Design a protein around this ligand. Structure first.
Ligand SMILES: [Ca+2]
Length: 96
């Protein structure tokens, strides 16, 4: 029960909601892949391509680095959950 204030996670939450509301093409791919942008534990930018809605589950448990408004890095563990019917929610949990 933590309010997600980190930009990168907030954008991914919106994208997951976008995907949840997008119909798949026959065979299960999204009509257009969604590009997700994160920063990994070592501080490197990463981008990932979401071709199918379930691809979002591959981000579950990924350790991310975020920057506070004070300029300090914070690491978090990303969480992605299927609440029912392949509808995904994105949140985080502390890493250390
Ligand atoms: Ca946004």
């Amino acid at each position: 029960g933590r309010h997600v204030v980190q930009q990168q996670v907030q954008v991914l939450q919106r994208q997951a909601s976008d995907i949840n509301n997008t119909k798949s093409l026959p065979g299960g791919k999204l009509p257009k892949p969604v590009t997700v942008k994160l920063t990994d534990e070592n501080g490197k930018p990463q981008t990932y391509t979401i071709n199918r809605r379930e691809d979002l589950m591959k981000l579950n448990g990924k350790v991310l680095s975020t920057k506070t408004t004070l300029g300090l890095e914070q690491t978090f563990r990303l969480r992605v959950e299927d609440i029912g019917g392949k509808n995904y929610r994105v949140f985080y949990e502390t890493n250390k």
